[PDB]
Design an enzyme around this catalytic site. Structure first.
Site, PDB file in Angstrom:
ATOM      1  N   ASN A  31      -1.735   9.216   1.103  1.00 11.66           N
ATOM      2  CA  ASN A  31      -1.884   8.180   0.640  1.00 11.66           C
ATOM      3  C   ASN A  31      -2.549   9.295  -0.831  1.00 11.66           C
ATOM      4  O   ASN A  31      -3.421  10.014  -0.532  1.00 11.66           O
ATOM      5  CB  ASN A  31      -4.341   8.093   1.178  1.00 11.66           C
ATOM      6  CG  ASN A  31      -4.420   7.032   0.458  1.00 11.66           C
ATOM      7  OD1 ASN A  31      -5.068   7.637  -0.846  1.00 11.66           O
ATOM      8  ND2 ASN A  31      -5.539   6.080   1.193  1.00 11.66           N
ATOM      9  N   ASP A  33      -4.282   8.141  -3.572  1.00  7.27           N
ATOM     10  CA  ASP A  33      -4.926   7.592  -4.428  1.00  7.27           C
ATOM     11  C   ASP A  33      -4.357   7.430  -6.128  1.00  7.27           C
ATOM     12  O   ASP A  33      -4.635   7.738  -6.843  1.00  7.27           O
ATOM     13  CB  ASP A  33      -5.669   9.076  -4.308  1.00  7.27           C
ATOM     14  CG  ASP A  33      -7.800   8.445  -5.485  1.00  7.27           C
ATOM     15  OD1 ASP A  33      -7.679   7.274  -5.555  1.00  7.27           O
ATOM     16  OD2 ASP A  33      -7.790   9.458  -6.161  1.00  7.27           O
ATOM     17  N   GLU A  59      -2.038   3.741  -0.798  1.00  6.36           N
ATOM     18  CA  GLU A  59      -2.646   3.531  -2.202  1.00  6.36           C
ATOM     19  C   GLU A  59      -2.810   3.264  -3.544  1.00  6.36           C
ATOM     20  O   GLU A  59      -2.981   4.255  -3.793  1.00  6.36           O
ATOM     21  CB  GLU A  59      -4.284   4.465  -2.564  1.00  6.36           C
ATOM     22  CG  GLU A  59      -5.218   3.649  -0.785  1.00  6.36           C
ATOM     23  CD  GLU A  59      -6.621   4.371  -1.425  1.00  6.36           C
ATOM     24  OE1 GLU A  59      -7.418   3.168  -2.647  1.00  6.36           O
ATOM     25  OE2 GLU A  59      -7.620   5.083  -0.309  1.00  6.36           O
ATOM     26  N   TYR A 134      -2.343   1.370   5.303  1.00 12.05           N
ATOM     27  CA  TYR A 134      -3.178   1.249   4.458  1.00 12.05           C
ATOM     28  C   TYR A 134      -4.514   0.110   5.096  1.00 12.05           C
ATOM     29  O   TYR A 134      -4.240  -0.996   4.805  1.00 12.05           O
ATOM     30  CB  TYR A 134      -3.349   1.255   3.055  1.00 12.05           C
ATOM     31  CG  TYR A 134      -4.218   1.533   2.474  1.00 12.05           C
ATOM     32  CD1 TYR A 134      -5.058   2.581   2.837  1.00 12.05           C
ATOM     33  CD2 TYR A 134      -4.986   0.513   1.336  1.00 12.05           C
ATOM     34  CE1 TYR A 134      -6.549   2.312   1.641  1.00 12.05           C
ATOM     35  CE2 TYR A 134      -6.067   1.102   0.844  1.00 12.05           C
ATOM     36  CZ  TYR A 134      -6.664   1.858   0.958  1.00 12.05           C
ATOM     37  OH  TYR A 134      -8.151   1.893   0.243  1.00 12.05           O
ATOM     38  N   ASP A 173      -3.090   5.525   6.331  1.00 16.45           N
ATOM     39  CA  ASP A 173      -3.896   6.099   6.294  1.00 16.45           C
ATOM     40  C   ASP A 173      -5.263   4.659   7.622  1.00 16.45           C
ATOM     41  O   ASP A 173      -4.890   3.809   6.764  1.00 16.45           O
ATOM     42  CB  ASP A 173      -5.605   6.090   5.241  1.00 16.45           C
ATOM     43  CG  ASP A 173      -6.351   5.973   4.309  1.00 16.45           C
ATOM     44  OD1 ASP A 173      -6.936   6.103   5.525  1.00 16.45           O
ATOM     45  OD2 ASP A 173      -6.870   5.615   3.560  1.00 16.45           O
ATOM     46  N   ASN A 175      -8.115   4.963   8.120  1.00 11.42           N
ATOM     47  CA  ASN A 175      -9.460   5.117   8.221  1.00 11.42           C
ATOM     48  C   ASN A 175     -10.737   4.566   9.003  1.00 11.42           C
ATOM     49  O   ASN A 175     -11.674   3.807   8.636  1.00 11.42           O
ATOM     50  CB  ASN A 175      -9.771   3.297   7.181  1.00 11.42           C
ATOM     51  CG  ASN A 175      -9.679   3.096   5.655  1.00 11.42           C
ATOM     52  OD1 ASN A 175     -10.598   4.590   4.970  1.00 11.42           O
ATOM     53  ND2 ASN A 175      -8.867   2.536   4.645  1.00 11.42           N
ATOM     54  N   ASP A 246      -5.402  10.586   8.096  1.00 10.95           N
ATOM     55  CA  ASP A 246      -4.579   9.544   8.409  1.00 10.95           C
ATOM     56  C   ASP A 246      -3.371  10.068  10.047  1.00 10.95           C
ATOM     57  O   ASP A 246      -4.237  11.623  10.116  1.00 10.95           O
ATOM     58  CB  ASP A 246      -3.426  10.507   7.009  1.00 10.95           C
ATOM     59  CG  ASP A 246      -3.974   9.860   6.114  1.00 10.95           C
ATOM     60  OD1 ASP A 246      -5.241  10.633   5.567  1.00 10.95           O
ATOM     61  OD2 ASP A 246      -4.094   8.609   5.526  1.00 10.95           O
ATOM     62  N   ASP A 271      -6.804  13.298  -3.483  1.00 17.57           N
ATOM     63  CA  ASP A 271      -8.434  12.936  -1.533  1.00 17.57           C
ATOM     64  C   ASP A 271      -7.928  13.194  -0.720  1.00 17.57           C
ATOM     65  O   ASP A 271      -8.638  13.570   0.543  1.00 17.57           O
ATOM     66  CB  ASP A 271      -9.294  12.063  -2.721  1.00 17.57           C
ATOM     67  CG  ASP A 271      -9.158  11.102  -2.124  1.00 17.57           C
ATOM     68  OD1 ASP A 271      -8.151  10.304  -2.580  1.00 17.57           O
ATOM     69  OD2 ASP A 271     -10.286   9.872  -2.599  1.00 17.57           O
ATOM     70  N   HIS A 272      -6.329  12.582  -0.062  1.00 20.73           N
ATOM     71  CA  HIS A 272      -6.247  12.670   1.330  1.00 20.73           C
ATOM     72  C   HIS A 272      -4.714  14.061   0.632  1.00 20.73           C
ATOM     73  O   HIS A 272      -4.532  14.094  -0.389  1.00 20.73           O
ATOM     74  CB  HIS A 272      -5.756  11.719   1.403  1.00 20.73           C
ATOM     75  CG  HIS A 272      -6.552  10.204   1.708  1.00 20.73           C
ATOM     76  ND1 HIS A 272      -6.325  10.304   2.947  1.00 20.73           N
ATOM     77  CD2 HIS A 272      -7.333   9.833   0.708  1.00 20.73           C
ATOM     78  CE1 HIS A 272      -6.804   8.737   3.164  1.00 20.73           C
ATOM     79  NE2 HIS A 272      -7.415   8.188   1.135  1.00 20.73           N
TER      80      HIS A 272
END
Length: 281
Positions: A31, A33, A59, A134, A173, A175, A246, A271-272
């Site tokens: 991911n 971002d 993302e 995602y 991801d 989530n 993830d 951030d991942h």
């Protein structure tokens, strides 16, 4: 405030299966971002070092029509497929880049309600099908939790369908941190997106129904502090206050081919962090 650093050093790459067969397929999922932000942060540098056969990105915040030119700097991943929200705005989005062209590429999960946000690519190969996703965030205040539960059901039914025809690898991801061992602060997150009972139960339902195995947890059932996401806030990454969001989930029939499932904790750009799967297919 109550957390200091917790050490995690991902074990060495195990590149041969339990049967001795060298890995023949390396898949990396990340991911990012935002594709442009990630590139600026030298994300492609890890990709070149990792040299995967297939790269799955989440993302991307970018449509197939407006991709950054730098993606051409991946000559070893020349077959590139992209999905983005059908409103054509800059959010969500997934990508799949592959050394070889898949037999077929599809987008979405066969349900109009869930196919408008650029969340899923399906790439069918000779001996397996790869899905990257995602998954919808449950949202601040859990305002999207009701939708997330609908998504989870539709997605599970779709995946069960795919797996009935070919062995399945799902990555991306998802989530949700499945179990307490999957995040630094379980106690304080039970009412937050990513660790609600609803979301955790959906993940368990997915594993049972398809069925699928969590590759990392299969190999490292008791290993704590292994995360793939840390909020940009509050020095969370430096303290390893994170969540494992993830995954690579595999058909049970692929377990004998499973060499390793890695977490590239130190790779920056988002951030991942990236995760990497080795299979001996």
């Amino acid at each position: 405030a109550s957390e200091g650093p917790a050490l995690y050093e991902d074990p060495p790459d195990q590149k041969t299966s339990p049967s001795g067969k060298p890995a023949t397929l390396k898949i990396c999922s990340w991911n990012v971002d935002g594709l442009r932000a990630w590139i600026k942060k030298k994300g492609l540098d890890w990709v070149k070092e990792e040299a995967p056969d297939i790269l799955c990105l989440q993302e991307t915040k970018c449509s197939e029509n407006k991709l950054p030119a730098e993606l051409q700097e991946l000559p070893g991943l020349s077959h590139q497929y992209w999905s983005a929200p059908s409103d054509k705005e800059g959010y969500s989005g997934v990508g799949l880049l592959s050394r070889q062209a898949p037999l077929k590429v599809s987008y979405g999960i066969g349900d109009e309600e869930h196919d408008q946000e650029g969340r899923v690519i399906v790439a069918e190969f000779d001996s397996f099908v790869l899905v990257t996703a995602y998954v919808p965030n449950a949202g601040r205040g859990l305002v999207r939790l009701e939708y997330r539960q609908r998504w989870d059901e539709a997605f599970r039914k779709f995946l069960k369908g795919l797996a009935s025809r070919k062995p399945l690898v799902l990555c991306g991801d998802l989530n949700v941190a499945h179990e307490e061992i999957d995040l630094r602060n379980p106690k304080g997150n039970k009412k937050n997106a990513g660790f609600t009972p609803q979301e955790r139960q959906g993940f368990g339902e997915l594993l049972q129904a398809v069925p699928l195995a969590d590759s990392f947890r299969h190999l490292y059932p008791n290993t704590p502090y292994a995360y793939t996401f840390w909020t940009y806030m509050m020095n969370a990454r430096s303290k390893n206050v994170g969540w494992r969001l993830d995954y690579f989930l595999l058909s049970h029939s692929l377990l004998p081919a499973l060499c390793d499932s890695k977490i590239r904790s130190k790779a920056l750009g988002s951030d991942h962090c990236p995760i990497t799967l080795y299979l001996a297919l």
